Enzyme design. Structure first.
Site, short mmCIF file in Angstrom:
data_model
loop_
_atom_site.label_atom_id
_atom_site.label_comp_id
_atom_site.label_asym_id
_atom_site.label_seq_id
_atom_site.Cartn_x
_atom_site.Cartn_y
_atom_site.Cartn_z
N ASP A 120 -12.65 2.24 1.01
CA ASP A 120 -12.30 2.40 -0.40
C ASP A 120 -13.54 2.40 -1.28
O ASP A 120 -13.64 3.19 -2.22
CB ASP A 120 -11.34 1.29 -0.85
CG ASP A 120 -9.95 1.43 -0.25
OD1 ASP A 120 -9.65 2.49 0.26
OD2 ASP A 120 -9.20 0.49 -0.32
N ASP B 283 0.83 -1.20 0.00
CA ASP B 283 0.00 0.00 0.00
C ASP B 283 0.87 1.25 0.00
O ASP B 283 1.67 1.47 0.92
CB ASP B 283 -0.93 0.01 1.21
CG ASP B 283 -1.92 1.17 1.19
OD1 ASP B 283 -2.94 1.05 0.55
OD2 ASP B 283 -1.65 2.17 1.81
N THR C 181 -3.22 6.56 -4.91
CA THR C 181 -2.16 7.11 -4.07
C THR C 181 -0.78 6.74 -4.61
O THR C 181 0.21 7.43 -4.32
CB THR C 181 -2.29 6.61 -2.62
OG1 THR C 181 -2.23 5.18 -2.59
CG2 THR C 181 -3.61 7.08 -2.02
N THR C 182 -0.69 5.66 -5.39
CA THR C 182 0.57 5.32 -6.04
C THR C 182 0.66 5.93 -7.44
O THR C 182 1.76 6.26 -7.91
CB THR C 182 0.74 3.79 -6.14
OG1 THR C 182 -0.34 3.23 -6.90
CG2 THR C 182 0.75 3.17 -4.75
#
Lengths: 524, 503, 493, 502
Positions: C361, C45, C78-79
């Site tokens: 999520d 994550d 987020t990545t």
């Protein structure tokens, strides 16, 4: 941690130290002078060209320099003018001495020469003195101003400095009495507010202090009301109100009766204490602690403005002019125990909402506190120093009507006189009397070097006209006008001041040249 | 000496050099605290945050701090111009062997030259009131620049334009209120005369109060004692203490009797109010507000027009406030209270609708200073051509005066112009356009007539600034020269640094 | 040296993206981090990776700030926002070596971003929050990570029931604090509840005689606690005057250790008052309760009044195998908030902990659909699609805009290149096929890990909300500006 | 570039102190250190000092060209070219200017500068006396840099009267300079006789009138002329000697074959044996021997003679002519003096100084001054010096900056700033305040008055026409011309590539 050095070589160490002192103060001499950055112990940045503060904030470890400063203090304390010239001239006197030492002149033979050479110089200066107060009294006031502007036009105020001279000459006219033949400079307090402009400075005929009336419903002006003993000021530590501690209370209240009972106590002490203001004889009340609101409204009917949280020295400054006293209790106060003035009024200055208090006698007062403003906090500090110095400029002009036409011209005039007496020596002292002139030349030389003029040819320019022509003032052009003649530019220094500069500098030669050992002991 | 003295100023210039211009570059701040990561092109933040060692550099800081309070804008240009004046002097000192005072005297003569040029270029529109309004848009068009608001400037232009047009008279700046509202893109901001407060009024009072009589109390009304504050509840039985508080309730009502003696419809308190004296305000039908801070008290004094009312002894002998509409509303996701039509109030409030806190922090400084600049355009109606034009106009006149001047002073006056030509150079480099080409082409324009050209840093060319609408203030640019003139006089007079006994 | 600061900032920042480059994709690799406290974490994550990293370079700390902005903006990617930024930084290094001034680079990237967002709209698959079918289809994409996906069809409409109620199509910003996910240990996803009120973590009454609940009751929102020093009951009885006078049939007292939330005897006194008792209610949970209830807290018992109560349909304690779950239904206060809570059930605590994260999520997925209606293809299809429409149109650009926009196009390939690398396919073979499929074929074509090749992601049902890609372009263009604009690093004091 | 341009700056630092009649000297220390030299001669300074930066190898070579081509302006070119590079540094590091932009600007301005030197030119073709007076003022400048600063007024007449009397070919071989020990500097004198420094002949006529001169390049000493490897293994010394005696008989015939020309003077480059010389005595012929090429090469063109290396038959060669051939002993040294030579305009300057250490410098001084004065007869246009031309040049360069594009503007002003450093170096080396004197001339020339220049004696500004400081149009053209050439070369250098040292 002591010193060991034997022979006259120790005096070379001593003189070389003085050259360090001079290298600091040298560049500060002159209206084109360069400033020094003063790092305060706390980090405050101060910028000044005043050699008194430069020497005061100057920290040096060689004890020889500590002597030079401590002795220069006498120039600031007694005269208050040219402390800068005392150090500059002394350095040159020691520099010429260093040459005399190497030539083999005995240390005392050097000192005896500077003493007799000064007897020649001061005498020849007197031959050229002028009377600034000559002819009419209105001319005295005129020339007094023309010179005062020369000390004030050299500071940041120089734009409109004539206004600072307006308050200065008029102040000393108010503070000087020809029957007294003296001026007590302590009769003038210097005070201003941070911010403002030159035109916001005022000439105040009486006392002004950083205070304002504590209650807006009280009258901003108190008068004797046609015939009373002026306006009395209560100077006490405790307020006129029911007693209330300013630390801790600890009043036990057992019931509602006891709870409100204090209000009954307050009502009688409200009217009693505000009546004790009127009965004590105070027209306004200033105490170290503030006053109860209900007492304040009972004060209103009697027109009794008041101020809270005021120190004794500030009210003392008023009490000096009003003859007030710090009486422990309000019961022993009288028309005299409380000092009297004629009018107290609160003056607002344009956008300045401070609204300061002014105490006047409605006549010629025994003290004045003039009002200073300036666009920067630090400008105000130096601006009041200009009033301090220009106050001493006129103070010396009152003390002695004899003046000299300065700007280095008197130093060159004296230098030429020393060279005139050089041929009459024809002896061992001829070596020393000539060096006195070489030292006297370092004052007009320093004046030129700080102005951007030729350091050598300027000396020949001044000497040319003061030798082949006349003793007429031939000064240095540091002000940027056309040419010499400070009589035309009205640049004038006090005679007694220049005499003290020469004599005190000679004393410094007696002090430095006669110290043979520096023994610095430790501490346990 | 001077090798150590004046060099302190060179560092100050490099600290701010990259911050000047519509495309300026940012500086990163971080302290030993490790949590002070700040990215800003704000000169006030950068100048105040960076610790300096050389006390001569500390002088330049104090000089610019005055500029910040005196004007509120131009603080970057003061540090830039003042530093380039000293940098040119450092080159004069070593290369030509110039006396320190000679340099000082030349900048004095050059200061007069620059003041003449800015005067010659003064363009004013007291005629054509519509064009004055347009000029206010253009002055804000330039003043609102340099901020993260640059994407939304057109909206902030009309907001500030109406704010200064709202004063329509006296330049009272405290009339302007700025509200920081979270939520939305900055284009959602609006201007409203409501003088928004974040608190309501009354316990249960009608939310719309018209023709109100507002009475302000500046003191503590939580168990309000009639000047018997300082007594104690010290009893041997708990029941006696509650009775003592009821004695306060008798005293609170006597204070409320004096407060209500005025015959008021609305009431505002600096501090909180205890339920009982507040319920008395509620029962007496008085719209009662509590917990007003410094600005609550101070702004209402300038809005409603009343006093702090330390004395409640009579309905007269004091100012009592008035408001046409007291409107309580749910606005900005917070209960707001709006005073409309205050005592002869010609003011307004600017409400900022931003996304987050850091964005509102910058717009607070932007609009605070933006109206501060505009506040000077009411008294000073003469305007100046921006885009670097005025800097080049001054450089031409300084070179003109260098035609007739003596030698030792001519070396300084020419250097003064070279420093003036560094101002548009820094602007062009910070915008990323050929710093040599643009500045030189400006010189050919201003030397051979064309006294309207400047830099188009959005398109990368040189254009007529009157067409592009790049407008500056006569007083702003005059203060840039004036403050720099005094700045150089101070630093050029430094001959040594003397340390008193350090703590 | 102002150029060296910018050179150092790019070199330093690229080393941050080199850490994340390996984590993109469901088959991506894991990162191990030994934290300053000695605890060693391991996960793929990205936000967790950067959250526990605490990079010490202040300029590199901005990349972490962007990650959080991506989480609060869309809630996913987020990545993708970090890897995308790293490509802009590496492309910027090429632009810097080519001799482009930092400000020319920054504004040119901003202009290319404006078109990038428009391109994302061009590829948008128009859907609506009324599409009850596709809403589940979108959830099933994110529920592909579900440990037991046999329950995915239960959590699918569960998230819809939370949002569809509190925010329909006529809505803008959904506050994820309004949908509070409250997990309860045990059970299975067969038992999930969309609670139209609040769910409390504290029980009601351990003593006998307790009401345990009250129907048609008023909710007490009190921060002031009842604490005495005959006098024991006399004090609480004296306080009973404030308890009853307020007309409050349920007291929810904030946890405070200075003064007892509910007095020991108050359990019996309120059983005479028929008042539901809840004590030791965590203040951080009061942050949830004191807001959603629409009423205001009581800081002094004397202020405890009628207007400060809630008007609840029912405040009930659910007791099933030792649960005793205090909850409210029908807050229905004039100033209330649309508060919904989800009861999560699962095998053990480790499962319901992961479930809460995945349901968070899923709410971010719908929140993306609320802010931005429309879906886009997955598998890097939007990144290849932009690079075609960008570079195809970039040939018509003139000036330095042509060279910077062309470099921007090459940076957009970092995502499909990374997706292919972490998937174990030849990066040239995959990107080449993606180019020919978007040029001649459909914009839905992309990388499929299921089929071991490049296939139609719409047919493979790999879809994602457009907000993820729009916020990726947005925050990336803001980041590359914020990094390129750093001219010096100064000590502050 | 940073190092390529700066590499040469050091060259200016070596010569920046040599500019001006008040300049300062450089001390040279040899590798042996015992042969130290004190000189202000700039060409000697540049040639003597080894420099290891390749950029300086170029600039040094540039100045060598000006030494051989013109003979003056070695410092003027080296300094001006160095100031162009000192300005270029500021055009690079602090400005960001491409090297080629700097090149094109310096070329543009060099054109305008040539125009200023042209517009200000003054010539006097009429009143040849006024040209003589200008030639005096020209020499007053070219005679600088030497101890001649005391006696310069007298050396101006020595050189001016020579170039005045030349009235013909500017070939400096018509003018010879002689160094004789003894006498003071003012004791030097000008002599029309192109004196040769040696007397030869045993019993030979020392006074020849209506002379025919035969310069000879042969061997009249002994036998075996150009015969190598010939030995006499003889049993009789008559068998060896007869062959030398035979060549002496052949020389006895060549003395007659010489005599049949009608010759009264015979000058030989090599030694003549007593007997072949003795035969000239009865012939009335002065026989000179062992005269070197350096001397007879100019006599070949001053006496108008012929080399005539072969005397095997009479009537086969040309001869010279001289009115008086006599021996003059001055300075305790005999000389051979000629008068009335073919092309009689010849002359020589005879130096009578205290020591050769001082004469060596004055020899090169007059050598260079004769070069300058020779060129002023072909280019009679003159310009005012003392920095007057340099400031007038800078005025025109500013005019170009009025009408100029954006990239070339910074370079045009740099060219002017370099021109303003030329009077700056002059003032500094004179020991005056250069900051005022340069800006005083700047204000004097900028605000009209195209007359003024630097007064190195009083430290003031005054008219160069009255003070008498003038220089050649051609000299100033070469200064600015070779300067733009020097920058054209050095500004074009970007990198230094080295083939491995041998």
């Amino acid at each position: 941690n002591k010193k060991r050095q034997h022979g006259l070589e120790a005096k070379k160490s001593h003189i070389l130290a003085a050259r360090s002192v001079a290298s600091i103060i040298k560049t500060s001499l002159g209206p084109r002078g360069l400033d020094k950055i003063l790092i305060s112990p706390d980090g405050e940045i101060t910028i000044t060209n005043d050699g008194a503060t430069i020497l005061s904030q100057m920290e040096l470890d060689n004890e020889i320099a500590k002597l030079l400063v401590q002795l220069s203090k006498s120039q600031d304390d007694e005269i208050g003018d040219g402390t800068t010239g005392v150090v500059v001239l002394a350095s040159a006197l020691l520099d010429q001495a260093l040459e005399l030492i190497q030539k083999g002149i005995h240390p005392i033979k050097i000192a005896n020469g500077f003493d007799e050479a000064a007897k020649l110089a001061i005498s020849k200066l007197e031959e050229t003195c002028d009377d600034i107060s000559a002819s009419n009294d209105e001319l005295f006031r005129d020339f007094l101003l023309r010179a005062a502007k020369t000390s004030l036009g050299s500071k940041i105020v120089s734009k409109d400095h004539d206004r600072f001279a307006e308050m200065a000459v008029e102040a000393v006219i108010n503070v000087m009495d020809k029957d007294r033949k003296d001026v007590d400079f302590d009769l003038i307090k210097m005070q201003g507010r941070v911010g403002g402009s030159i035109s916001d400075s005022k000439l105040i005929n009486g006392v002004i202090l950083d205070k304002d009336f504590s209650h807006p419903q009280m009258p901003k002006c108190v008068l004797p009301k046609e015939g009373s003993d002026g306006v009395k000021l209560a100077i006490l530590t405790c307020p006129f109100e029911p007693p209330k501690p300013k630390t801790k209370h600890k009043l036990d209240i057992s019931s509602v009766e006891e709870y409100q009972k204090l209000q009954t106590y307050e009502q009688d002490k409200f009217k009693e204490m505000i009546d004790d203001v009127k009965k004590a004889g105070a027209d306004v009340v200033i105490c170290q602690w503030g006053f109860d609101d209900e007492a304040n409204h009972l004060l209103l009917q009697n027109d009794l403005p008041a101020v809270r949280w005021v120190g004794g020295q500030e009210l003392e400054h008023i009490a000096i002019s009003t003859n007030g006293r710090i009486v422990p209790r309000f019961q022993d106060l009288s028309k005299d125990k409380l000092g009297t003035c004629s009018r107290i009024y609160e003056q607002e200055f344009g956008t300045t909402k401070d609204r300061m208090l002014i105490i006047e006698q409605s006549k010629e007062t025994k003290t004045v506190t003039c009002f200073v403003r300036g666009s920067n906090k630090m400008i105000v500090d130096e601006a009041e120093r200009a009033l301090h110095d220009s106050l001493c400029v006129v103070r010396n002009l009152v003390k002695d009507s004899r003046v000299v036409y300065g700007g280095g011209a008197a130093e060159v005039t004296m230098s030429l006189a020393v060279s005139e007496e050089a041929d009459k020596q024809r002896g061992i002292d001829q070596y020393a009397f000539r060096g006195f002139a070489q030292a006297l030349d370092t004052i007009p030389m320093t004046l030129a070097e700080n102005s951007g003029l030729d350091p050598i040819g300027t000396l020949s320019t001044l000497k040319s006209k003061q030798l082949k022509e006349k003793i007429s003032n031939i000064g240095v052009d540091c002000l940027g006008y056309g040419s010499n003649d400070m009589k035309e530019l009205f640049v004038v220094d006090p005679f007694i001041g220049k005499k003290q500069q020469i004599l005190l500098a000679t004393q410094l030669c007696r002090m430095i040249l006669k110290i043979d050992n520096v023994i610095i002991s430790g501490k346990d | 000496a001077r090798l150590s003295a004046f060099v302190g100023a060179i560092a100050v210039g490099d600290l701010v050099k990259s911050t000047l211009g519509p495309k300026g570059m940012d500086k990163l701040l971080q302290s030993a605290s490790s949590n002070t990561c700040m990215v800003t092109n704000d000169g006030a933040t950068i100048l105040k945050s960076i610790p300096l060692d050389n006390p001569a550099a500390k002088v330049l800081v104090n000089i610019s701090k005055v500029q910040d309070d005196e004007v509120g804008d131009g603080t970057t240009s003061v540090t830039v111009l003042s530093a380039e004046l000293l940098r040119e002097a450092e080159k004069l000192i070593d290369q030509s062997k110039i006396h320190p005072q000679t340099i000082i005297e030349g900048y004095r003569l050059a200061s007069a030259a620059a003041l003449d040029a800015l005067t010659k270029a003064a363009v004013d529109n007291s005629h054509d009131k519509t064009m004055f309004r347009e000029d206010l848009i253009h002055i804000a068009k330039t003043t609102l620049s340099s901020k993260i608001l640059s994407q939304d400037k057109d909206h902030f232009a009309e907001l500030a334009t109406n704010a200064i047009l709202r004063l329509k008279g006296s330049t009272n700046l405290e009339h302007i209120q700025i509200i920081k509202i979270l939520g939305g893109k900055l284009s959602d901001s609006f201007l409203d005369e409501g003088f928004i407060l974040a608190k309501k009024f009354g316990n249960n009072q009608p939310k719309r109060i018209e023709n109100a009589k507002i009475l302000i109390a500046n003191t503590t009304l939580d168990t309000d004692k009639v000047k018997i504050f300082g007594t104690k509840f010290k009893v041997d039985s708990t029941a006696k203490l509650a009775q003592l508080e009821k004695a306060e309730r008798e005293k609170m009502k006597n204070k409320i009797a004096k407060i209500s003696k005025f015959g008021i419809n609305t009431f505002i308190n600096r501090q909180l109010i205890y339920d009982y004296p507040e319920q008395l305000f509620t029962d007496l039908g008085i719209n009662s507000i509590e917990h007003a801070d410094f600005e609550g008290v101070e702004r209402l004094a300038l809005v409603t027009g009343g006093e702090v009312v330390s004395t409640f002894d009579e309905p007269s002998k004091c100012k009592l406030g008035e408001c046409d509409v007291i409107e309580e509303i749910m606005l900005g996701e917070q209960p707001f209270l709006k005073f409309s039509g205050c005592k002869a109030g010609e003011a307004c409030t600017i409400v900022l609708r931003g996304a987050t806190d850091q964005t509102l922090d910058e717009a607070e400084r932007s609009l605070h200073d933006a109206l501060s600049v505009l506040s000077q355009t009411t008294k000073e109606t003469r305007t100046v051509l921006g885009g670097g034009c005025a800097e080049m106009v001054m450089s031409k006149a300084v070179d003109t005066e260098a035609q007739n001047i003596d030698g030792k002073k001519s070396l300084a006056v020419e250097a003064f112009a070279r420093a003036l030509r560094q101002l548009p150079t820094i602007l062009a480099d910070n915008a990323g356009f050929d710093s040599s080409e643009l500045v030189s082409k400006l010189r050919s324009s201003i030397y051979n007539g064309i006294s309207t050209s400047g830099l188009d840093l959005n398109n990368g060319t040189i254009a007529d600034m009157r067409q592009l609408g790049i407008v500056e203030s006569y007083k702003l640019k005059r203060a840039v020269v004036s403050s720099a003139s005094e700045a150089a006089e101070v630093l050029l007079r430094v001959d040594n640094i003397i340390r008193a006994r350090p703590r | 040296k102002p150029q060296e600061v910018r050179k150092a900032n790019i070199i330093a920042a690229r080393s941050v993206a080199d850490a994340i480059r390996t984590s993109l994709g469901p088959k991506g690799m894991d990162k191990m981090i030994k934290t300053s406290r000695g605890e060693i974490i391991i996960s793929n994550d990205g936000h967790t990776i950067l959250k526990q990293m605490a990079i010490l370079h202040p300029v590199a700390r901005m990349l972490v700030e962007v990650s959080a902005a991506q989480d609060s903006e869309a809630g996913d990617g987020t990545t993708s926002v970090v890897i995308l930024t790293g490509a802009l930084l590496g492309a910027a290094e090429r632009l810097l070596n080519k001799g482009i001034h930092p400000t020319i680079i920054a504004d040119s990237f901003q202009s290319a971003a404006k078109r990038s967002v428009d391109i994302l709209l061009e590829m948008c698959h128009k859907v609506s929050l009324s599409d009850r079918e596709q809403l589940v289809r979108a959830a099933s994409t994110s529920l592909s990570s579900k440990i037991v996906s046999q329950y995915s069809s239960f959590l699918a409409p569960l998230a819809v029931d939370s949002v569809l109620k509190i925010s329909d199509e006529n809505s803008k910003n959904v506050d994820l604090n309004d949908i509070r996910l409250v997990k309860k240990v045990g059970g299975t996803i067969d038992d999930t509840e969309m609670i139209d009120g609040v769910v409390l973590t504290q029980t009601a009454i351990k003593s006998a005689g307790g009401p345990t609940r009250k129907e048609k009751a008023k909710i007490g929102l009190i921060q002031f606690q009842i604490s005495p020093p005959k006098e024991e009951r006399a004090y609480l009885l004296n306080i009973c005057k404030k308890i009853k006078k307020a007309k409050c049939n349920v007291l929810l007292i904030q946890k405070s250790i200075l003064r007892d939330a509910v007095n020991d005897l108050a359990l019996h006194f309120l059983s005479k008052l028929n008042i539901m008792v809840v004590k030791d209610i965590e203040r951080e949970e009061i942050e949830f309760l004191s807001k959603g209830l629409g009423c205001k807290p009581i800081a002094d018992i004397e202020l405890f009044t009628e207007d400060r109560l809630g008007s609840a349909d029912l405040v009930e304690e659910i007791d099933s195998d030792g649960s005793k779950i205090v909850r409210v239904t029908g807050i229905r206060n004039n100033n209330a908030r649309p508060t919904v809570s989800v009861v999560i059930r699962g095998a053990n605590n480790m499962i319901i902990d992961e479930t809460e994260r995945s349901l968070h999520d899923a709410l971010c997925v719908i929140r993306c659909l609320v802010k931005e209606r429309g879906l886009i293809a997955g598998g890097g299809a939007p990144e290849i699609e932009i690079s075609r429409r960008l570079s195809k149109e970039a040939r018509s650009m003139e000036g330095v805009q042509a060279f910077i926009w062309q470099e921007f196009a090459s940076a957009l390939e970092v995502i499909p290149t990374t997706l292919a690398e972490n998937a174990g396919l030849n990066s040239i073979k995959v990107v080449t096929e993606l180019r020919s499929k978007h040029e001649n074929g459909e914009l839905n074509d992309g990388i499929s890990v299921r089929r071991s090749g490049t296939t139609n992601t719409y047919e493979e049902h790999i879809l994602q909300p457009v907000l993820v890609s729009t916020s990726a372009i947005t925050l990336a263009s803001e980041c590359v500006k914020s990094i390129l604009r750093i001219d010096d690093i100064a000590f502050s004091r």
